[PDB]
Amino acid sequence: DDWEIPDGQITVGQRIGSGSFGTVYKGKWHGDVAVKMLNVTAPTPQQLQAFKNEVGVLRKTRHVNILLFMGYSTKPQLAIVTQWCEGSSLYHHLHASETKFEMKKLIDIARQTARGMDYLHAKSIIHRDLKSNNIFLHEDNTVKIGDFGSGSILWMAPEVIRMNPYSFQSDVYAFGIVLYELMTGQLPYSNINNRDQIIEMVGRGSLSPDLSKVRSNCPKRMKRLMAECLKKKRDERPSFPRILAEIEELA
Amino acid sequence: DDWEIPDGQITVGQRIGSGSFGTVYKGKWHGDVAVKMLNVTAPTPQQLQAFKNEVGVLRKTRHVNILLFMGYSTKPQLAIVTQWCEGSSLYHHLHASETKFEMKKLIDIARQTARGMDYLHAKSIIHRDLKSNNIFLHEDNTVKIGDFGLATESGSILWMAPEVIRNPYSFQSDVYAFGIVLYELMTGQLPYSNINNRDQIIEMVGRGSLSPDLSKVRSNCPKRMKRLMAECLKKKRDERPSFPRILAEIEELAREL
Ligand SMILES: CCS(=O)(=O)Nc1ccc(F)c(C(=O)c2c[nH]c3ncc(-c4cccnc4)cc23)c1F
């Protein structure tokens, strides 16, 4: 039916962060929620529908590894309401906490991410921006993928960089970088700190992630799987169901 | 929009529960999932309303403390696809595991349960079958409320309020059952131990001379929880609070101590 939450039902709290679209706050609504208020004030009737369309896309996601959509608001500002995640992003663990994860967890996280990613493809949903920042680990066990309802070029496929370039293949490339981060412990092109350089080089096929940076612990069974994900040639990339099967066999 | 999952996608596995309500197997569908299916030649549409009601009530929930409904089925067996849960029920932990908790966790479990129950009532949903058995502990410490079935919008006798025991079901009945669940958390024990007759409980609780022994609460248990619990267990419907007030008092406690 309708998942709108009437004005005054949510007690908006502390400002968590800002994104290109939206500002995230912690909220009070039958427990803890997260509210993403759109960068918008007025009830513009035509962008209203445009907003509602994105809600329609969100409300078709009922998977454990996808961040739980819970409702939307219209009156105290346009807003997306989801579950609250305890802990930090996958980016924070890998790069900002220096926290040592056992190799067993890494594969699980990838497996969880692939579970979420396959589901979106099954529902014919292209994420368009899958990175470790949009992967929230609830209580450091459970993957929640969000932010799918002049940017992050590290997870960007070659065909996306040079301009329909957004497809299920580009999400596959994004996952390879995610795997890279997990299996190398860091972001790609770390030595080359030049955005424009990377854009031009990865775009022309001159640059690709370095796999000598993977640790010895990494199974070469899916070290090969990255290569499949990280292919410059998009049609030579594995689909996510294909991907989901291979990763799972690792335990 | 459609939540129908046509078959072939679903890879059924090992069953965990059975009966005449639908067997529940552990399937794999884009990961670990759960399926509750009728093993029948044909559910000649007497079952077809029960199934349709549950799909209607499930499709309208999206909460972390409510079991995650993932889909339904019509073509072969009737089935309900929900998230897979890792762990055992609250009933298992308190009673069937002989495990024990700190006050800290016990009050937390009540809160998460209160959140889901508050959510259900806000969506104008009556659970009608709330008990420790239907409260799953997923990831070993996060509440999942399920087994809707009797939901709408024998063996379950202990969580039954007099007006149901003596349409009886209401938000108030859910409230009474909540008080019983609180009792299991704050005592570790099921109500009416000194009564091993089904006929004793059913008459006495219905009559209004039987009530849980609140002397059995833990020493570490808050005086506010024991007070809150007695309010949910009121013999008279009207004197029972609503979950917004129930959740409010709990939240302070969890923060207070
Ligand atoms: C599926 C809906 S979406 O539109 O595609 N995504 C989405 C919508 C609304 C949101 F608020 C959030 C969000 O940032 C968070 C949603 N729950 C969260 N829980 C924790 C955090 C967080 C992240 C980093 C540091 N501290 C807290 C961030 C979020 C969100 F990701």
* A196 Cβ contact partners less than 8 Å away, ≥ 6 residues apart: none
Distances (CA, A) of A114 to A121, A243, B196, B216: 10, 7, 51, 48
Give the SS3 label for residue A223.
Answer: helix
Domain that holds residue A1: 1-86
Q: Torsion over CA of B146, B150, B154 and B157, rounded to 10 degrees?
A: 70
Q: How was this structure determined?
A: X-ray
Kindly report the nearest CA distance between residue A16 and chain B, in angstroms.
Answer: 20
Calpha distance A56→A149 (Å, rounded): 10
Calpha distance A220→A236 (Å, rounded): 19
- For chain A, say whether B84 makes contact (Cβ under 8 Å): yes
The Å distance, Cα A220 to ligand 1 centre, comes to 33
Q: Check the annotation: does B56 bind a ligand.
A: no
Catalytic positions of B, please?
A: 129
How does DSSP assign chain B, residue by residue? ---B--TTS-EEEEEEE-SSS-EEEEEESSSEEEEEE---S---TTHHHHHHHHHHHHTT---TTB--EEEEE-SSS-EEEEE---S-BHHIIIIIS-----HHHHHHHHHHHHHHHHHHHHTT-B-S--SGGGEEEETTTEEEE---TT-B-----TT--HHHH-----HHHHHHHHHHHHHHHHHSS-S-TT---HHHHHHHHHHT-----TTSS-SSS-HHHHHHHHHHT-SSGGGS--HHHHHHHHHHHHHH-
B63 shares its domain with B156 = no
Give the SS3 label for residue A13.
Answer: strand
- Decide if A219 contacts A246 (C-beta within 8 A): no
B40 shares its domain with B137 = no
Calpha distance B158→B187 (Å, rounded): 15
CATH number at residue A42: 3.30.200.20
A130 shares its domain with A247 = yes
Calpha distance A69→B64 (Å, rounded): 10
Q: What does the DSSP 8-state code read for residue A93?
A: I
Relative to beta strand A142-145, strand A79-83 is: unpaired
Relative to beta strand B32-37, strand B11-17 is: unpaired
Distances (CA, A) of A109 to A90, A106, A247, B178: 9, 5, 10, 36
- Chain-chain contact of B64 with A68 (C-beta, under 8 angstroms): yes
B136 shares its domain with B227 = yes
- For chain A, say whether B115 makes contact (Cβ under 8 Å): yes
Kindly state the tokens that stand for A38.
């759109």
Locate the DSSP E strands across chain A.
11-18, 23-28, 32-37, 69-73, 79-83, 135-138, 142-145
- Decide if B88 contacts B32 (C-beta within 8 A): no
Q: Residue A49 is inside which H or E element, if any?
A: helix A45-58
B179 shares its domain with B119 = yes
Resolution given for this structure, in angstroms: 2.7
Give the SS3 label for residue A97.
Answer: coil
- Decide if B57 contacts B152 (C-beta within 8 A): yes
- Decide if A193 contacts A162 (C-beta within 8 A): no
Calpha distance A82→A70 (Å, rounded): 5
- Decide if A26 contacts A14 (C-beta within 8 A): yes
- Ligand 1 binding pocket (C-beta < 6 A) is A 16, 24, 34, 36, 58, 67, 69, 80, 82, 84-85, 88-89, 136, 146-149
Relative to beta strand A142-145, strand B32-37 is: unpaired
Calpha distance B235→B165 (Å, rounded): 11
Q: Which of B17, B51, B86 is the last residue of a domain?
A: B86
Q: Check the annotation: does B22 bind a ligand.
A: yes
Q: Which of A25, A59, A86 is the last residue of a domain?
A: A86
A64 shares its domain with A108 = no
- Decide if B78 contacts B21 (C-beta within 8 A): no
Calpha distance A238→A218 (Å, rounded): 20
Partnered with residue A12 across adjacent β-strands are A27
Cα-only R_g, chain B: 19
Relative to beta strand B11-17, strand B23-28 is: antiparallel
- For chain B, say whether A244 makes contact (Cβ under 8 Å): yes
A105 shares its domain with A201 = yes
Kindly report the nearest CA distance between residue B50 and chain A, in angstroms.
Answer: 20
Q: How many residues does chain A have?
A: 251
The residue to which tokens 């929620």 are assigned: A33
Domain total in chain A: 2
Partnered with residue A142 across adjacent β-strands are A138
B137 shares its domain with B216 = yes
- Chain-chain contact of A31 with B64 (C-beta, under 8 angstroms): yes
- Decide if B160 contacts B133 (C-beta within 8 A): no
Q: Check the annotation: does B178 bind a ligand.
A: no
- For chain B, say whether A235 makes contact (Cβ under 8 Å): no
- For chain A, say whether B40 makes contact (Cβ under 8 Å): no
Kindly state the tokens that stand for A58.
């969100």
B167 shares its domain with B203 = yes
B96 shares its domain with B215 = yes
What is the chain B residue with the closest CA to A140? B139
Distances (CA, A) of B175 to A2, A168, A236, B117: 27, 47, 58, 9
- Decide if B238 contacts B252 (C-beta within 8 A): no
Calpha distance B132→B178 (Å, rounded): 9
Q: Which of A2, A73, A74 is nearest to B59 (CA)?
A: A2
Nearest CA to ligand 1 atom 24: A88
What is the chain B residue with the closest CA to A244? B30
Q: Which of B102, B104, B70, B109 is nearest to B87 (CA)?
A: B109
Q: To 10 degrees, what angle do helices B223-232 and B243-256 make?
A: 170
A119 shares its domain with A195 = yes
Q: A65 to chain B: which residues are within 8 Å by CB? A: 31
- Decide if B229 contacts B183 (C-beta within 8 A): yes
Kindly state the tokens that stand for A159.
């065909």
Q: Which of B160, B161, B65 is nearest to B118 (CA)?
A: B65
Q: Angle CA(A58)–CA(B120)–CA(B64) in degrees, nearest 5?
A: 50
Kindly report the nearest CA distance between residue A32 and chain B, in angstroms.
Answer: 9
Give the SS3 label for residue A219.
Answer: coil
Instruction: Report H helices in A185-217.
Output: 195-204
The residue to which tokens 């070659």 are assigned: A158
B113 shares its domain with B232 = yes
CATH number at residue A152: 1.10.510.10
Q: Which of B71, B86, B101 is the last residue of a domain?
A: B86
Calpha distance A64→B30 (Å, rounded): 10
Measured from the Cα of A68, ligand 1's closest atom is 1
Q: Which of A236, A230, A234, A237 is nearest to A210 (CA)?
A: A230
CB atoms within 10 A of CB B166: 13
